Amino acid sequence: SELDQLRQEAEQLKNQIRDARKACADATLSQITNNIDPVGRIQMRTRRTLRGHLAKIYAMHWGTDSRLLVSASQDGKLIIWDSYTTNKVHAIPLRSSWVMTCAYAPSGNYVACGGLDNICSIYNLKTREGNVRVSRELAGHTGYLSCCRFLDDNQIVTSSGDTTCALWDIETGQQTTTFTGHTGDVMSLSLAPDTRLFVSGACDASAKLWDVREGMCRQTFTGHESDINAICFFPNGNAFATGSDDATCRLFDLRADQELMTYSHDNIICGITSVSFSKSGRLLLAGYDDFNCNVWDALKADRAGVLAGHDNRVSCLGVTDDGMAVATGSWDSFLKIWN
Amino acid sequence: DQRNEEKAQREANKKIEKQLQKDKQVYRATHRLLLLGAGESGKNTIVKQMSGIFETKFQVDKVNFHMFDVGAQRDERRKWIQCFNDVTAIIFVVASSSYNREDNQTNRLQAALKLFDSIWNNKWLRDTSVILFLNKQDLLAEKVLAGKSKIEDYFPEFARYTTPEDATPEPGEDPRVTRAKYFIRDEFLRISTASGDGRHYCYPHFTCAVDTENIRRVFNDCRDIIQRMHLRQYELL
């Protein structure tokens, strides 16, 4: 009875949905894309080497204009650069020394940041003073913040180390919605292009989507081997790729609700700490911890190119909204732009 | 007319370049440390000698030491510790006395040794030397001079262990107290010297939590850490 009874009925649900997944898995992506033309060996050189940081760069984010990319490090300030002419547009100092994430609002007015201080600090950019200042300081999380994203300048989704996600309103400063159902430290959350569902991945090898309105998890996604570090949505909004600490990148399909196909190699030892897609979605991008980065053919599981411009852990990666460039930021306190 | 915005952009970029150079000086002049232990291990008493985390900035002979103690945080340390590969040292405070009575894990030294082993062999913390503080030495002496619970049956290598010839029994105490103290020290040093390849070392001490010399010990250990790093990079050590 009680705990054991619910455990056995939960196992009944588990193998029932496993049987359902096997029934709906009539084929794989490999046998349906084997006749497709491969992208071949591609290469792309560095265009700009953004420099001026001291500590390890932990995150970044482009804007809608794909011109100003944010950057955050453990030095104590967050730098808003310019992709062209490498000029440092802004530099906002931070109260806390280490931050783990940054967010660039689609309007470009607000910039979010946060880290081990357990407080999401959001700064303006177009104040009447002409300088930067603290706009909002969201508090309530008892764990470290790992990733933040912007829907508009009225709502922010923040992923914390409390094994929960949060959706806050800017002016109220309180948790409008709380997302629970996870047991490991939630690391990366990524928003769909329609800005309706966002996928979050914890330290329990499980990534699930959440709806921003009712605040309930709809579909879970298990089948990995270790803690998932980074997730990005497919450009169509019906798939998402997960990288973790086991040298694998699994592409889940939202409608199929199953593991489609996986990217790995025998020589890769370290895990993935940055996953992102291109505009067309044909090119996955993975940043490992062996001082390297690579691009994967998202439909053929064939490596198409290796980028070795960094001499430290590639902790962060980003792709412009128009798909014109790729920015990789590592523990070398550098940022590299490729195209 | 279109050149003026980029002219202002160069002027700005020069301003942040100067500000970042000043910050680079003031930040390379600042030494960061993380204090780590359990709640009963003695974090608060070491902090007392001068948000989920707390900060403490102090000066030891015109040297800016920023010591940070993690407070309201989850016990899963496998991924938020990776932020601390750039600290010059990692202060590790353990409760040497608490080896029984049944308190917390009841094998506090074993848990601390496992945590130290995980920290030492981490692929990102390999470049950070770990200052180690053996707190609660008076309590250990009182509980080991005459106690119902013996450290035996908790560690089966007490019989094959004696006081080392290089030991420093500066305070006149029982030989068993010195034996236990350097036993715990050698248990920590066994994992300290089993890996690292000279990249980082441990600096054990004996903090009684009743003296203000711990900041001086930390300052001396940081000086030794930087001296050893310079010597190794110069191909001398």
């Epitope: 329990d204 600490d245 | 340390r77 496998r78 848990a111 496992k114 890996s195």
Partner: nanobody
Framework: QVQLQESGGGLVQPGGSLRLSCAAS????????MNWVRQAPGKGLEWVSD????????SYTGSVKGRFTISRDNAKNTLYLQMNSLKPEDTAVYYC?????????????????????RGQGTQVTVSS
């Protein structure tokens, strides 16, 4: 998904012998360090023992050193623990823990509460 199922155990007279079998499914067993942990009733967790990827490196808690034997087998992906000469102090629940990352010498959160990759474990009680 990672699944660790622990079998064996039960009520056994003190001074006897006992075995636990931890079956691991959903991942590669020949790549992850294995850990056995215990939790006493009304007390915190306590790490029992650990074994490396190939079984070369074996370490035990000093209290159980010489009486516990941990052996892993990667062919059928199973981790066995043998207890000899039980004592009434060793009444506890036992979990078959897991290394967080492949090819990694360290092991961080085996004794941490609400660990993700921890099995249900078995309750072993020794008394009269």
């Amino acid at each position: 998904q990672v699944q660790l199922q622990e079998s064996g155990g039960g009520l056994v007279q003190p001074g006897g012998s006992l075995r636990l079998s931890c079956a691991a499914s959903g991942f590669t067993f020949s790549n992850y360090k294995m850990n056995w942990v215990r939790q006493a009733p009304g007390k915190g967790l306590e790490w029992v023992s650990d074994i490396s990827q190939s079984g070369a490196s074996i370490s035990y808690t000093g209290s159980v050193k010489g009486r516990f034997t941990i052996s892993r087998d990667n062919a059928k992906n199973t981790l066995y623990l043998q207890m000899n000469s039980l004592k009434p102090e060793d009444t506890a629940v036992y979990y078959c823990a897991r290394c967080p990352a492949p090819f990694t010498r360290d092991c961080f959160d085996v004794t941490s509460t609400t660990y993700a990759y921890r099995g249900q474990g078995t309750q072993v009680t020794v008394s009269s």
